[model samples]
Target: AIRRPEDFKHYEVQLPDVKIHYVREGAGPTLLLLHGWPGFWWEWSKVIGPLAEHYDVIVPDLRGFGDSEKPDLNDLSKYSLDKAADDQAALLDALGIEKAYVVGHDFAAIVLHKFIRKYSDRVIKAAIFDPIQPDFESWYSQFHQLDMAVEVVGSSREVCKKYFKHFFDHWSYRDELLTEEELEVHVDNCMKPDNIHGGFNYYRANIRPDAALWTDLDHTMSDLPVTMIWGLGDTCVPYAPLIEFVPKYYSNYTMETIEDCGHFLMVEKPEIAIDRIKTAFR
Candidate 1:
């Protein structure tokens, strides 16, 4: 059981060029929690303790978010999904954990997709929330504003807050689900010039012209189960595309839908989301 906030110790691992920050708690089979963009390790705060009762929880702020080391703005290669996945792999190795169950949200879900594909043997089971698969139609075009966003929106905290608010409002089923305080935390961390630039690098590398040339064979059917819990109300990543694309990648997978929830499914509806994650782990 969770005793106090101070009991949750912060730690970092030295990867090649960047350092990854993570929090570890409890004891049992490992459960790795990966947060989305505009979010940090605290994304799983609500469910961390409850889940920790059953499994050892490892929550990491992806590179460039929260306390994790940010890459240089010009170094787009460091922010590749493949590199992010490798960072997690290396982190696990450093901690002497050979395999783990993964729970990923938003952009981290995309990282999980590549992680399972690249290191199939290193995962026990995987759960992803509100992810847009890279192979989807016109995916690249959707993020066309990212470069411009870094310059225009990321120019100031006020500007970034206004810009990010649009997503927090529109991408959600109802804006009221998020408190002003919660939204502010997200905006404050993500608006930092380095963090904003780092966040957009994920989009830059994946959506660029040369991305087409890089293709790895699919490892859709894992011996371990994969679960996708989608928020039907998400404006950013619609349900229709998931219906069309999910099965193409996973033969051994189950998808659960949350009707009233939005892009931030777990945060918007933690009770249902936690139950779904428990079921997936089982």
Candidate 2:
């Protein structure tokens, strides 16, 4: 029932370099929810209203995704996960929040990992769902990192629609994960000028041909309590990487797998996603 985005209060914050658009609902402990590429704050549409009843849910369209300011495309400083992590930190600072419980999905989990590495003191806890983790063989990143990736994908309207539609269809355990109206919400965002570039910029900066990107970035282990909810059916973000990385980098972590779910767990199973978040953060 919580599908309409207009059901909640939407606001924007001016991070130093880029502006961030977020929806703030309910009030209590602050919960910062970050969305990944090919996604926006609307990705949390189903679970946001429910979680908001118990906490102040801050769902931001990380840097380049939604209504957030799309800064210079090739500027890695403005588009990297390093910048994505800082923008979230700056978002909290601008909102006068000292600390927050964090939830990230897809590539946003990568951002959460970076956020915890540098700003662990500012996080109460973190949860990631069906994330596309680094330190693994990711074919999609290879494609996204291509310089003309956006030009090709974003070239024709049908091509752009088909590209995203492929993921929404193939990456779900259930059929029609996104209703016609719902699908358009994401499609409309991606079809906008400079939006796809914003997303691809993150991929270009984070992924390497050999994928030693994590080495150049923060891979330090942390005591941060992290929960990973992975989908067994996901073609993106394989189970191999989560198992390979979680134990090595996080001293306190839990991995829960959803039997029939795929890459978009939050949308595929909102009730379960809500429960996992509440239990873990509690």
Candidate 3:
């Protein structure tokens, strides 16, 4: 685990056009927790205190989302998941951690899959929350922004702004699920004008380079342990594919289905999810 700075306050370190803001806490074995798009590290606030007792925790806001530098999406190359994973590697290098027990949620979970594939040695084991095993199609949000960007291209800024706001509003599975404070954090910092593109760019760039915008392909599982915790009622990423397709890649893995929960499993079902994470550590 990397050394924890005294005082435990949040800090930012520069990474090219933007700097990533993160909090590193606790001691013992290193564990990195990554949050996905449309959410800040606050989503994991509920479980961090408990888990801190056993592991050094590193939680990061993926680039272009959260407090990280909001960059343009038009330049898709910068927002690629592979680069984001490399940026994560840079953060570890800066902190002097050679490897960690990594965990990710939502979009971050998908990034974790790629990180595991590309930086296999950096990870000892991983817990993926509601991630559709890679090469599988991501629903709604991925395609929504893709359509709007193509439709509104070369149009006035107002056109882009209006459509973008609507996209953010509908992207979440729950209506009235978040408070104004949380919404403001996601909007002004992560989803605001300059940054929204980075989230969408993940979809645009992944197309063809991988499979179609969404499709299944063979994904090799690392020898390291893997865990999948999914919200049973996730409207956005229904549990079907996870049941049907994930088994192929993972030779040794466990799947836990949390009933009556949706996509934001961390927020809606923190205790249940935390138990699975704790179980993974055992």
Candidate 4:
């Protein structure tokens, strides 16, 4: 059954500058699920129930995406990954959670990386799925161009959907796995003007003059147990060099590669995704 948004319990929290909408389910240790661009908390619908069996899942519509409140389109600083990580930390504090297992995909993965690095004590175990390391020298130029293109073209509804569709088709190894209804959910949310600006700000903030400078300000990598999940077939964020390069930045780390899977690994193969999550947190 396709679960409707109303089927889940929703909660909101007031951060310093924005209000975040998140859904909590089940009863056990906390499991924070963070989504990427063009996606919200609902991206985890398939795995949420199964995960709930053993975990109290915390899924939030990241600021600028889903039902979360957007910051002023002029205040690009509010959309930085640093702010996003702080929001997650604040969300945990507001819920009275000291630590939780964190999982992230795409843009959220980048935020998780920063979170684990900056706030290691607050994370029990962390997992990243197919991330784009915008700060890495190899990938910086590519992301810079992408964000700049979005800036030049503008954040129109039509432009948002057009780019969304292109990624849906080009990034997935098995596009057939995504139903029209599922795709529409992402497209419709992204077509909203605020959502479009919020989504693009993630990219825009990275290219800002001082963004990359933060890379040198911190050198300590988190010792918190970390797991990297990659889709061998993911065209959006290719798996090879990253697989080789990621290790240099972590102290305790391991990786699992899913054969025949693509960028959206959780939705494409929920069973494997579920199995991996269980093994990682076990």
lDDT of 1 by residue, 1-282 (tens): 123324567898887757998988877889999987656887677788778888889998888677788887677777777777888898888888998999888888878888888888889999988775323425333553367766786777778777767766666787654577776777777765578777766667665667631346443445458888877664444467677777777878888778887777767888887788787786
lDDT per model vs. reference: 0.75, 0.81, 0.65, 0.77
lDDT of model 2, residue 258? 88
TM for every model, in the order presented, reads 0.86, 0.91, 0.76, 0.87
Query: 234 in model 4: Cα distance from truth in Å?
Result: 4.5
- Return the TM-score for candidate 2, rounded to 2 decimals: 0.91
Residue range 21-125, candidate 3, lDDT tens digits: 787778778888887755566667666766788888888778776666655656766676666677788888778899888888876776787787778888878
In model 2, which regions exceed 4 Å deviation?
A: 133-139, 210-212, 215-217, 234-237
Worst 10 residues of 1 by lDDT: 133-142
Best by TM-score: 2
Deviating ranges (above 4 Å) for candidate 1: 1-8, 133-148, 212-214, 219-221, 234-237
lDDT of 4: 0.77
Per-residue lDDT tens digits for candidate 2, residues 1-282, read 447777768998777778888888877899998888667899888988889899999998888788898888867667777778889889999999999999988878888888988888899999988775422436767788776788888897778888888778777877656887887778888888888888887777766654334544466888889998888764444577568867888899998888888778788888899999989988
> Cα lDDT for residue 270, model 2?
86
- The residue pairs that clash in candidate 1, if any, are none
RMSD of each candidate relative to the true structure: 3.6, 2.5, 5.8, 3.5
